[PDB]
Amino acid sequence: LKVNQDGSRVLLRDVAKIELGGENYDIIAEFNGQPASGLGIKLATGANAL
Amino acid sequence: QLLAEAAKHPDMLTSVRPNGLEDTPQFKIDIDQEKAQALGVSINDINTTL
């Protein structure tokens, strides 16, 4: 991100924590109290559910 | 591995080949961001020129 007059280098690790995390943390799902995910599937109009 | 295994069965399968191109040499250019910043040249300008 920056180079100082001292000659040191400012890296993205210095000013922030880089993580692999959900795009948004709004929804969290549990199955019988255990962490879980899932897909809620809504049928298309005029389609057979079976 | 699958192609070799198929070739090991001449009496059942014939001319089992890939329908695609093999890997080829490519010219890789490693642009040093630190050097570009030090010399006052923007990465965007370098990439656009190239």
mmCIF file of N, CA and C in Angstrom:
data_model
loop_
_atom_site.group_PDB
_atom_site.id
_atom_site.type_symbol
_atom_site.label_atom_id
_atom_site.label_comp_id
_atom_site.label_asym_id
_atom_site.label_seq_id
_atom_site.Cartn_x
_atom_site.Cartn_y
_atom_site.Cartn_z
ATOM 1 N N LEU A 1 0.800 -1.217 0.000
ATOM 2 C CA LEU A 1 0.000 0.000 0.000
ATOM 3 C C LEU A 1 0.836 1.270 0.000
ATOM 4 N N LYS A 2 2.002 1.257 0.640
ATOM 5 C CA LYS A 2 2.786 2.472 0.801
ATOM 6 C C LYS A 2 4.242 2.100 1.033
ATOM 7 N N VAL A 3 5.132 3.025 0.684
ATOM 8 C CA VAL A 3 6.559 2.912 0.963
ATOM 9 C C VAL A 3 6.957 4.120 1.800
ATOM 10 N N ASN A 4 7.562 3.866 2.956
ATOM 11 C CA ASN A 4 7.929 4.934 3.869
ATOM 12 C C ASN A 4 9.289 5.522 3.495
ATOM 13 N N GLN A 5 9.590 6.686 4.079
ATOM 14 C CA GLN A 5 10.897 7.298 3.871
ATOM 15 C C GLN A 5 12.005 6.454 4.485
ATOM 16 N N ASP A 6 11.717 5.780 5.599
ATOM 17 C CA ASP A 6 12.688 4.880 6.208
ATOM 18 C C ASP A 6 13.132 3.799 5.232
ATOM 19 N N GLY A 7 12.283 3.442 4.271
ATOM 20 C CA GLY A 7 12.526 2.321 3.392
ATOM 21 C C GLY A 7 11.700 1.097 3.710
ATOM 22 N N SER A 8 10.964 1.107 4.819
ATOM 23 C CA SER A 8 10.079 0.005 5.146
ATOM 24 C C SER A 8 8.887 -0.014 4.195
ATOM 25 N N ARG A 9 8.203 -1.153 4.165
ATOM 26 C CA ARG A 9 7.070 -1.371 3.277
ATOM 27 C C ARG A 9 5.820 -1.610 4.107
ATOM 28 N N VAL A 10 4.751 -0.893 3.777
ATOM 29 C CA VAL A 10 3.448 -1.088 4.400
ATOM 30 C C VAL A 10 2.667 -2.063 3.536
ATOM 31 N N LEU A 11 2.333 -3.217 4.101
ATOM 32 C CA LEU A 11 1.586 -4.246 3.400
ATOM 33 C C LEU A 11 0.159 -4.304 3.924
ATOM 34 N N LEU A 12 -0.720 -4.900 3.120
ATOM 35 C CA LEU A 12 -2.114 -5.033 3.518
ATOM 36 C C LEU A 12 -2.264 -5.822 4.809
ATOM 37 N N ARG A 13 -1.285 -6.661 5.148
ATOM 38 C CA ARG A 13 -1.335 -7.388 6.412
ATOM 39 C C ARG A 13 -1.100 -6.462 7.599
ATOM 40 N N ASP A 14 -0.443 -5.323 7.375
ATOM 41 C CA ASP A 14 -0.107 -4.432 8.479
ATOM 42 C C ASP A 14 -1.324 -3.655 8.964
ATOM 43 N N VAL A 15 -2.205 -3.251 8.045
ATOM 44 C CA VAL A 15 -3.336 -2.396 8.385
ATOM 45 C C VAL A 15 -4.655 -3.148 8.413
ATOM 46 N N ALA A 16 -4.650 -4.454 8.166
ATOM 47 C CA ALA A 16 -5.897 -5.202 8.132
ATOM 48 C C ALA A 16 -5.612 -6.678 8.357
ATOM 49 N N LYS A 17 -6.664 -7.397 8.728
ATOM 50 C CA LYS A 17 -6.637 -8.849 8.843
ATOM 51 C C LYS A 17 -7.288 -9.438 7.600
ATOM 52 N N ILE A 18 -6.567 -10.318 6.915
ATOM 53 C CA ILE A 18 -7.046 -10.941 5.688
ATOM 54 C C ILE A 18 -7.545 -12.334 6.040
ATOM 55 N N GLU A 19 -8.806 -12.606 5.713
ATOM 56 C CA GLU A 19 -9.476 -13.823 6.137
ATOM 57 C C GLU A 19 -10.307 -14.356 4.980
ATOM 58 N N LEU A 20 -10.672 -15.626 5.070
ATOM 59 C CA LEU A 20 -11.592 -16.254 4.127
ATOM 60 C C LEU A 20 -12.911 -16.443 4.866
ATOM 61 N N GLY A 21 -13.861 -15.537 4.632
ATOM 62 C CA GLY A 21 -15.091 -15.533 5.395
ATOM 63 C C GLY A 21 -16.284 -15.265 4.503
ATOM 64 N N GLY A 22 -17.463 -15.584 5.027
ATOM 65 C CA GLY A 22 -18.682 -15.444 4.256
ATOM 66 C C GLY A 22 -18.828 -14.081 3.615
ATOM 67 N N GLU A 23 -19.482 -14.025 2.453
ATOM 68 C CA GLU A 23 -19.723 -12.738 1.809
ATOM 69 C C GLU A 23 -20.567 -11.837 2.698
ATOM 70 N N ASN A 24 -21.604 -12.396 3.314
ATOM 71 C CA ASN A 24 -22.376 -11.708 4.335
ATOM 72 C C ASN A 24 -22.660 -12.687 5.463
ATOM 73 N N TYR A 25 -22.712 -12.162 6.686
ATOM 74 C CA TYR A 25 -22.909 -12.968 7.884
ATOM 75 C C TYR A 25 -24.336 -12.873 8.410
ATOM 76 N N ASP A 26 -25.294 -12.569 7.534
ATOM 77 C CA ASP A 26 -26.663 -12.335 7.976
ATOM 78 C C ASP A 26 -27.334 -13.627 8.428
ATOM 79 N N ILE A 27 -27.207 -14.691 7.642
ATOM 80 C CA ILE A 27 -27.940 -15.933 7.859
ATOM 81 C C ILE A 27 -26.980 -16.989 8.384
ATOM 82 N N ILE A 28 -27.356 -17.633 9.487
ATOM 83 C CA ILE A 28 -26.614 -18.760 10.042
ATOM 84 C C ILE A 28 -27.612 -19.850 10.404
ATOM 85 N N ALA A 29 -27.310 -21.086 10.015
ATOM 86 C CA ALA A 29 -28.247 -22.192 10.136
ATOM 87 C C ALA A 29 -27.710 -23.258 11.081
ATOM 88 N N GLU A 30 -28.608 -23.814 11.889
ATOM 89 C CA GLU A 30 -28.290 -24.917 12.780
ATOM 90 C C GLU A 30 -29.280 -26.047 12.553
ATOM 91 N N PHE A 31 -28.769 -27.273 12.572
ATOM 92 C CA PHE A 31 -29.574 -28.485 12.476
ATOM 93 C C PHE A 31 -29.429 -29.238 13.789
ATOM 94 N N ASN A 32 -30.510 -29.297 14.563
ATOM 95 C CA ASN A 32 -30.498 -29.959 15.865
ATOM 96 C C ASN A 32 -29.375 -29.414 16.741
ATOM 97 N N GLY A 33 -29.139 -28.107 16.642
ATOM 98 C CA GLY A 33 -28.127 -27.447 17.435
ATOM 99 C C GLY A 33 -26.721 -27.531 16.886
ATOM 100 N N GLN A 34 -26.511 -28.225 15.771
ATOM 101 C CA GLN A 34 -25.194 -28.331 15.171
ATOM 102 C C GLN A 34 -25.050 -27.334 14.029
ATOM 103 N N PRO A 35 -23.858 -26.799 13.773
ATOM 104 C CA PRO A 35 -23.709 -25.884 12.637
ATOM 105 C C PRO A 35 -24.090 -26.582 11.342
ATOM 106 N N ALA A 36 -24.753 -25.851 10.450
ATOM 107 C CA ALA A 36 -25.239 -26.463 9.224
ATOM 108 C C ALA A 36 -25.436 -25.382 8.176
ATOM 109 N N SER A 37 -25.574 -25.825 6.928
ATOM 110 C CA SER A 37 -26.008 -24.942 5.855
ATOM 111 C C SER A 37 -27.194 -25.582 5.157
ATOM 112 N N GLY A 38 -27.651 -25.001 4.061
ATOM 113 C CA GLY A 38 -28.722 -25.627 3.317
ATOM 114 C C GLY A 38 -29.176 -24.762 2.170
ATOM 115 N N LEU A 39 -30.006 -25.372 1.332
ATOM 116 C CA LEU A 39 -30.646 -24.707 0.209
ATOM 117 C C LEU A 39 -32.152 -24.830 0.375
ATOM 118 N N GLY A 40 -32.833 -23.695 0.452
ATOM 119 C CA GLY A 40 -34.278 -23.671 0.380
ATOM 120 C C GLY A 40 -34.706 -23.511 -1.061
ATOM 121 N N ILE A 41 -35.371 -24.523 -1.605
ATOM 122 C CA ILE A 41 -35.690 -24.589 -3.023
ATOM 123 C C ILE A 41 -37.165 -24.266 -3.198
ATOM 124 N N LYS A 42 -37.437 -23.232 -3.995
ATOM 125 C CA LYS A 42 -38.781 -22.817 -4.367
ATOM 126 C C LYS A 42 -39.051 -23.243 -5.802
ATOM 127 N N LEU A 43 -40.169 -23.934 -6.003
ATOM 128 C CA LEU A 43 -40.521 -24.468 -7.311
ATOM 129 C C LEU A 43 -40.855 -23.350 -8.291
ATOM 130 N N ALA A 44 -40.484 -23.553 -9.551
ATOM 131 C CA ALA A 44 -40.809 -22.593 -10.596
ATOM 132 C C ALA A 44 -42.298 -22.635 -10.916
ATOM 133 N N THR A 45 -42.813 -21.510 -11.408
ATOM 134 C CA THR A 45 -44.226 -21.425 -11.748
ATOM 135 C C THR A 45 -44.576 -22.440 -12.828
ATOM 136 N N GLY A 46 -45.676 -23.157 -12.621
ATOM 137 C CA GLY A 46 -46.119 -24.148 -13.584
ATOM 138 C C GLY A 46 -45.170 -25.315 -13.746
ATOM 139 N N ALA A 47 -44.640 -25.836 -12.644
ATOM 140 C CA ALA A 47 -43.738 -26.975 -12.666
ATOM 141 C C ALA A 47 -44.259 -28.042 -11.715
ATOM 142 N N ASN A 48 -43.838 -29.279 -11.955
ATOM 143 C CA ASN A 48 -44.261 -30.410 -11.140
ATOM 144 C C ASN A 48 -43.332 -30.536 -9.939
ATOM 145 N N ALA A 49 -43.912 -30.496 -8.738
ATOM 146 C CA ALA A 49 -43.106 -30.586 -7.526
ATOM 147 C C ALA A 49 -42.422 -31.942 -7.414
ATOM 148 N N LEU A 50 -43.124 -33.017 -7.774
ATOM 149 C CA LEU A 50 -42.552 -34.353 -7.640
ATOM 150 C C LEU A 50 -41.385 -34.555 -8.600
ATOM 151 N N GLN B 1 -4.060 -40.900 -17.216
ATOM 152 C CA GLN B 1 -4.222 -42.240 -16.663
ATOM 153 C C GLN B 1 -5.392 -42.964 -17.316
ATOM 154 N N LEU B 2 -6.519 -42.271 -17.491
ATOM 155 C CA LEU B 2 -7.664 -42.890 -18.148
ATOM 156 C C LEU B 2 -7.346 -43.263 -19.588
ATOM 157 N N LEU B 3 -6.631 -42.397 -20.307
ATOM 158 C CA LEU B 3 -6.264 -42.700 -21.685
ATOM 159 C C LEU B 3 -5.358 -43.920 -21.758
ATOM 160 N N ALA B 4 -4.382 -44.018 -20.853
ATOM 161 C CA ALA B 4 -3.513 -45.190 -20.837
ATOM 162 C C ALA B 4 -4.303 -46.456 -20.534
ATOM 163 N N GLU B 5 -5.200 -46.392 -19.547
ATOM 164 C CA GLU B 5 -6.006 -47.560 -19.213
ATOM 165 C C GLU B 5 -6.875 -47.982 -20.390
ATOM 166 N N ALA B 6 -7.462 -47.012 -21.095
ATOM 167 C CA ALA B 6 -8.255 -47.335 -22.276
ATOM 168 C C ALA B 6 -7.389 -47.952 -23.365
ATOM 169 N N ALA B 7 -6.184 -47.416 -23.567
ATOM 170 C CA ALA B 7 -5.270 -47.987 -24.546
ATOM 171 C C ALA B 7 -4.862 -49.405 -24.181
ATOM 172 N N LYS B 8 -4.919 -49.763 -22.901
ATOM 173 C CA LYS B 8 -4.641 -51.130 -22.480
ATOM 174 C C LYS B 8 -5.793 -52.089 -22.773
ATOM 175 N N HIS B 9 -6.803 -51.662 -23.532
ATOM 176 C CA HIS B 9 -7.934 -52.506 -23.913
ATOM 177 C C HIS B 9 -8.186 -52.365 -25.410
ATOM 178 N N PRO B 10 -7.247 -52.816 -26.246
ATOM 179 C CA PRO B 10 -7.425 -52.645 -27.697
ATOM 180 C C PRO B 10 -8.641 -53.363 -28.252
ATOM 181 N N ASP B 11 -9.029 -54.495 -27.666
ATOM 182 C CA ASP B 11 -10.109 -55.305 -28.215
ATOM 183 C C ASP B 11 -11.494 -54.767 -27.882
ATOM 184 N N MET B 12 -11.603 -53.802 -26.971
ATOM 185 C CA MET B 12 -12.889 -53.224 -26.602
ATOM 186 C C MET B 12 -13.045 -51.765 -26.998
ATOM 187 N N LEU B 13 -11.973 -50.976 -26.958
ATOM 188 C CA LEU B 13 -12.030 -49.555 -27.266
ATOM 189 C C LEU B 13 -10.996 -49.224 -28.329
ATOM 190 N N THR B 14 -11.364 -48.336 -29.251
ATOM 191 C CA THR B 14 -10.500 -47.958 -30.359
ATOM 192 C C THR B 14 -10.401 -46.443 -30.447
ATOM 193 N N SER B 15 -9.182 -45.954 -30.660
ATOM 194 C CA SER B 15 -8.912 -44.537 -30.894
ATOM 195 C C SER B 15 -9.590 -43.662 -29.840
ATOM 196 N N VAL B 16 -9.286 -43.957 -28.580
ATOM 197 C CA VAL B 16 -9.738 -43.144 -27.458
ATOM 198 C C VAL B 16 -8.734 -42.011 -27.292
ATOM 199 N N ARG B 17 -9.145 -40.799 -27.635
ATOM 200 C CA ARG B 17 -8.263 -39.647 -27.703
ATOM 201 C C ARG B 17 -8.908 -38.448 -27.029
ATOM 202 N N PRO B 18 -8.111 -37.464 -26.610
ATOM 203 C CA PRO B 18 -8.690 -36.230 -26.067
ATOM 204 C C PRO B 18 -9.208 -35.324 -27.171
ATOM 205 N N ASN B 19 -10.365 -34.721 -26.923
ATOM 206 C CA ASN B 19 -10.922 -33.710 -27.822
ATOM 207 C C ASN B 19 -10.550 -32.311 -27.336
ATOM 208 N N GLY B 20 -9.248 -32.079 -27.217
ATOM 209 C CA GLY B 20 -8.767 -30.810 -26.704
ATOM 210 C C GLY B 20 -7.285 -30.657 -26.952
ATOM 211 N N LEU B 21 -6.789 -29.467 -26.630
ATOM 212 C CA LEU B 21 -5.396 -29.118 -26.857
ATOM 213 C C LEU B 21 -4.569 -29.361 -25.601
ATOM 214 N N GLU B 22 -3.314 -29.749 -25.809
ATOM 215 C CA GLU B 22 -2.392 -29.953 -24.705
ATOM 216 C C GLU B 22 -1.778 -28.624 -24.274
ATOM 217 N N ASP B 23 -1.143 -28.636 -23.107
ATOM 218 C CA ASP B 23 -0.491 -27.437 -22.604
ATOM 219 C C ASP B 23 0.668 -27.042 -23.510
ATOM 220 N N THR B 24 0.889 -25.741 -23.620
ATOM 221 C CA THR B 24 1.894 -25.164 -24.494
ATOM 222 C C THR B 24 2.712 -24.138 -23.727
ATOM 223 N N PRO B 25 3.920 -23.833 -24.198
ATOM 224 C CA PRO B 25 4.717 -22.788 -23.546
ATOM 225 C C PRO B 25 4.024 -21.435 -23.601
ATOM 226 N N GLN B 26 4.211 -20.658 -22.539
ATOM 227 C CA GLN B 26 3.661 -19.319 -22.427
ATOM 228 C C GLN B 26 4.721 -18.402 -21.843
ATOM 229 N N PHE B 27 4.672 -17.136 -22.245
ATOM 230 C CA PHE B 27 5.641 -16.131 -21.825
ATOM 231 C C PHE B 27 5.080 -15.392 -20.616
ATOM 232 N N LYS B 28 5.629 -15.678 -19.439
ATOM 233 C CA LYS B 28 5.176 -15.067 -18.199
ATOM 234 C C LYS B 28 6.016 -13.835 -17.898
ATOM 235 N N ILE B 29 5.344 -12.729 -17.591
ATOM 236 C CA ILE B 29 5.992 -11.486 -17.191
ATOM 237 C C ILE B 29 5.599 -11.205 -15.748
ATOM 238 N N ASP B 30 6.591 -11.161 -14.864
ATOM 239 C CA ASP B 30 6.384 -10.842 -13.457
ATOM 240 C C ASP B 30 6.734 -9.374 -13.253
ATOM 241 N N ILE B 31 5.717 -8.553 -13.019
ATOM 242 C CA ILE B 31 5.906 -7.128 -12.779
ATOM 243 C C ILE B 31 6.050 -6.916 -11.279
ATOM 244 N N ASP B 32 7.170 -6.329 -10.868
ATOM 245 C CA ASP B 32 7.440 -6.093 -9.454
ATOM 246 C C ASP B 32 6.729 -4.816 -9.028
ATOM 247 N N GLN B 33 5.702 -4.961 -8.189
ATOM 248 C CA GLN B 33 4.942 -3.797 -7.746
ATOM 249 C C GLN B 33 5.818 -2.841 -6.949
ATOM 250 N N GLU B 34 6.708 -3.378 -6.112
ATOM 251 C CA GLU B 34 7.592 -2.520 -5.331
ATOM 252 C C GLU B 34 8.466 -1.665 -6.238
ATOM 253 N N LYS B 35 9.065 -2.280 -7.261
ATOM 254 C CA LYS B 35 9.915 -1.524 -8.174
ATOM 255 C C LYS B 35 9.113 -0.482 -8.940
ATOM 256 N N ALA B 36 7.924 -0.852 -9.419
ATOM 257 C CA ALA B 36 7.103 0.103 -10.156
ATOM 258 C C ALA B 36 6.734 1.293 -9.282
ATOM 259 N N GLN B 37 6.369 1.037 -8.024
ATOM 260 C CA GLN B 37 6.054 2.128 -7.109
ATOM 261 C C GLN B 37 7.281 2.988 -6.839
ATOM 262 N N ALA B 38 8.445 2.357 -6.671
ATOM 263 C CA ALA B 38 9.660 3.108 -6.370
ATOM 264 C C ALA B 38 10.024 4.053 -7.507
ATOM 265 N N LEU B 39 9.890 3.598 -8.750
ATOM 266 C CA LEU B 39 10.246 4.400 -9.911
ATOM 267 C C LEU B 39 9.132 5.342 -10.345
ATOM 268 N N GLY B 40 7.998 5.344 -9.650
ATOM 269 C CA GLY B 40 6.946 6.296 -9.947
ATOM 270 C C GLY B 40 6.132 5.982 -11.178
ATOM 271 N N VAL B 41 5.958 4.704 -11.504
ATOM 272 C CA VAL B 41 5.159 4.275 -12.645
ATOM 273 C C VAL B 41 4.008 3.428 -12.123
ATOM 274 N N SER B 42 2.792 3.771 -12.536
ATOM 275 C CA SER B 42 1.604 3.085 -12.052
ATOM 276 C C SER B 42 1.448 1.726 -12.722
ATOM 277 N N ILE B 43 0.966 0.755 -11.944
ATOM 278 C CA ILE B 43 0.713 -0.576 -12.487
ATOM 279 C C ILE B 43 -0.325 -0.505 -13.597
ATOM 280 N N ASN B 44 -1.322 0.368 -13.441
ATOM 281 C CA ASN B 44 -2.346 0.500 -14.469
ATOM 282 C C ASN B 44 -1.739 0.938 -15.794
ATOM 283 N N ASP B 45 -0.823 1.908 -15.759
ATOM 284 C CA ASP B 45 -0.185 2.359 -16.992
ATOM 285 C C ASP B 45 0.633 1.243 -17.627
ATOM 286 N N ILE B 46 1.374 0.489 -16.813
ATOM 287 C CA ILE B 46 2.179 -0.608 -17.342
ATOM 288 C C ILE B 46 1.287 -1.633 -18.027
ATOM 289 N N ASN B 47 0.218 -2.048 -17.345
ATOM 290 C CA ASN B 47 -0.668 -3.059 -17.907
ATOM 291 C C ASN B 47 -1.353 -2.551 -19.166
ATOM 292 N N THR B 48 -1.793 -1.291 -19.164
ATOM 293 C CA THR B 48 -2.441 -0.741 -20.348
ATOM 294 C C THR B 48 -1.481 -0.701 -21.527
ATOM 295 N N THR B 49 -0.246 -0.249 -21.300
ATOM 296 C CA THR B 49 0.730 -0.205 -22.383
ATOM 297 C C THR B 49 0.999 -1.601 -22.925
ATOM 298 N N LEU B 50 1.231 -2.567 -22.033
ATOM 299 C CA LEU B 50 1.515 -3.927 -22.477
ATOM 300 C C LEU B 50 0.350 -4.497 -23.276
#
